[PDB]
Curated annotation (Swiss-Prot):
Effect of residue 48 to A: Impairs binding to acetylated histones
Region Interaction with histone, annotated ranges: 46-92
Subunit details: Found in a complex containing NCOA2; NCOA3; IKKA; IKKB and IKBKG. Probably part of a complex with HIF1A and EP300. Interacts with GATA1; the interaction results in acetylation and enhancement of transcriptional activity of GATA1. Interacts with MAF and ZCCHC12. Interacts with DAXX; the interaction is dependent on CBP sumoylation and results in suppression of the transcriptional activity via recruitment of HDAC2 to DAXX. Interacts with phosphorylated CREB1. Interacts with CITED4 (C-terminal region). Interacts (via the TAZ-type 1 domain) with HIF1A.
Annotated protein name in UniProt: CREB-binding protein
Implicated disorder: Chromosomal aberrations involving CREBBP may be a cause of acute myeloid leukemias. Translocation t(8;16)(p11;p13) with KAT6A; translocation t(11;16)(q23;p13.3) with KMT2A/MLL1; translocation t(10;16)(q22;p13) with KAT6B. KAT6A-CREBBP may induce leukemia by inhibiting RUNX1-mediated transcription.
Region (Interaction with ASF1A): 84-102
Organism of origin: Homo sapiens
Function (record text): Acetylates histones, giving a specific tag for transcriptional activation. Mediates acetylation of histone H3 at 'Lys-18' and 'Lys-27' (H3K18ac and H3K27ac, respectively). Also acetylates non-histone proteins, like DDX21, FBL, IRF2, MAFG, NCOA3, POLR1E/PAF53 and FOXO1. Binds specifically to phosphorylated CREB and enhances its transcriptional activity toward cAMP-responsive genes. Acts as a coactivator of ALX1. Acts as a circadian transcriptional coactivator which enhances the activity of the circadian transcriptional activators: NPAS2-BMAL1 and CLOCK-BMAL1 heterodimers.
Domain Bromo stretches: 7-114
Annotated compartments: Cytoplasm; Nucleus
Record text about domains: The KIX domain mediates binding to HIV-1 Tat.
Modification after translation, per record: Methylation of the KIX domain by CARM1 blocks association with CREB. This results in the blockade of CREB signaling, and in activation of apoptotic response.
């Protein structure tokens, strides 16, 4: 009975893109997240056993760019999935885990006022 899909996908693309862009701008911290994790290249054959739903910046970019997000929270859910996969798979002491945490912090700071602009 509630209202759904009040925003056009293209309005969400415009509103949210800056938050994606801020993650891309993080150097070196975005580098492990730019492309899908390739278990064969990284020599981690258990990756897809542990991470059942992979997500990365390129995939999010392409969904946002092509209007695949129909609700703002669907984009946020994908960013969080990317982070949560990285924190699940990687050791807490690891370079990639620390980089995840830095991206997560940048994202939090970026997304809160944007989601208020959608209020
Ligand atoms: C968030 C990415 C992830 O979980 N990876 C698994 C462990 C890992 N180690 N090194 C990387 C990596 C570093 C730079 C560029 C691409 C991947 C990755 C990617």
């Amino acid at each position: 009975s509630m209202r759904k899909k009040i925003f056009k996908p293209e309005e969400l693309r415009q509103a949210l893109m800056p938050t994606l862009e801020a993650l891309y701008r993080q150097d070196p911290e975005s580098l492990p997240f730019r492309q899908p994790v390739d278990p064969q290249l990284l020599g981690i054959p258990d990756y897809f056993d542990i991470v059942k739903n992979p997500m990365d910046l390129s995939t999010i970019k392409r969904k946002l760019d092509t209007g695949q997000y129909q609700e703002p929270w669907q984009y946020v859910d994908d960013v969080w999935l990317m982070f949560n996969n990285a924190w699940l798979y990687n050791r807490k002491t690891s370079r990639v885990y620390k980089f995840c945490s830095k991206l997560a912090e940048v994202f939090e700071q970026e997304i809160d006022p944007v989601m208020q602009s959608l209020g």
